[PDB]
Amino acid sequence: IQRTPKIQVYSRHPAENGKSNFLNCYVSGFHPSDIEVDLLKNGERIEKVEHSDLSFSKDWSFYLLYYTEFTPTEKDEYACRVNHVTLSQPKIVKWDRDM
Amino acid sequence: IPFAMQMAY
């Protein structure tokens, strides 16, 4: 009856250190719809984060895009923290510029 | 444009 989210964290544009871009966290394939998604900068919740309107795929599973403007650097670590009914603890997915 | 007829399940 319940489906756990798939999670991808990536940038809108190819990452260039010092160049403004958008950090994305795409959550999909989950059911039911309630989900908590935060974008992190060095373990801290970014407070200005936007998200898409709730929709679903042909298999009825829900998807949402969470996004914020960011400037990648060599040092700063970005991630996405997801909580859902299917998860015992929040799942953290680190941003990898090659994924 | 959406479908205008209302019908409960």
Partner: protein
Amino acid sequence: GSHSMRYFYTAMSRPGRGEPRFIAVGYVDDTQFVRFDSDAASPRTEPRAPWIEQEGPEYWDRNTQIFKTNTQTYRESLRNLRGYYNQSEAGSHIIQRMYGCDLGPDGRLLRGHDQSAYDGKDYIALNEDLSSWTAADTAAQITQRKWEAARVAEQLRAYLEGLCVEWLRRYLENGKETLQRADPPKTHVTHHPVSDHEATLRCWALGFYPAEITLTWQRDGEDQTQDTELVETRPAGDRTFQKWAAVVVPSGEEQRYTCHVQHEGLPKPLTLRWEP
């Protein structure tokens, strides 16, 4: 090319936390153009694509009346379905509905759709003939009989073959610069050693629209379906999509591998290899 319109409804109960939320979204292909949310400070149909903004106040009022009435209809439906499955008033349940029309390259109706789910399970669907229903179980048979009594299928067929197609064609013309523009993928092959004797070859596709794409890896001209790691197509946030496919290859054997890319925006399909 081929185009479709879909409306997606989600109604979710939340006992102890107010009345059920009803959200509707409308799409033309992979472009969302309208939303209605019963939880908004002032619930109203809102534009979500620039080409729908030109629609008159009568259009917005008509949409809002329909969606405000659906908020009530779906709250009754959630109460009805809870009764049909002998469920307690304590749990949260969801009804999803999706409907719309598909057109082929000539703009003619290919087929109509109407499908509903309860807690993520198929519940009832209009058959391809647009005249009959397929009910998943004895609960959905109750809905089927109500919908037969109100002559729902007859009204839904007239909408699917009429208004749905006519409005889709209007949106495709108003939004032609984006909805009828296929943006090809920007492509490249990366190489990442995994160990002294294997490496990952990753084929990237970025900036494409619509989302439909075929990305495959071949070894000596034969498809590597079982050995390819293929990520779900993901939105970039600027209307475009992204995707990658990866294979783990023995070191020194990289030139035996080719990545093949098929997409509507491409003048020709691509054959890519790792270029050291």
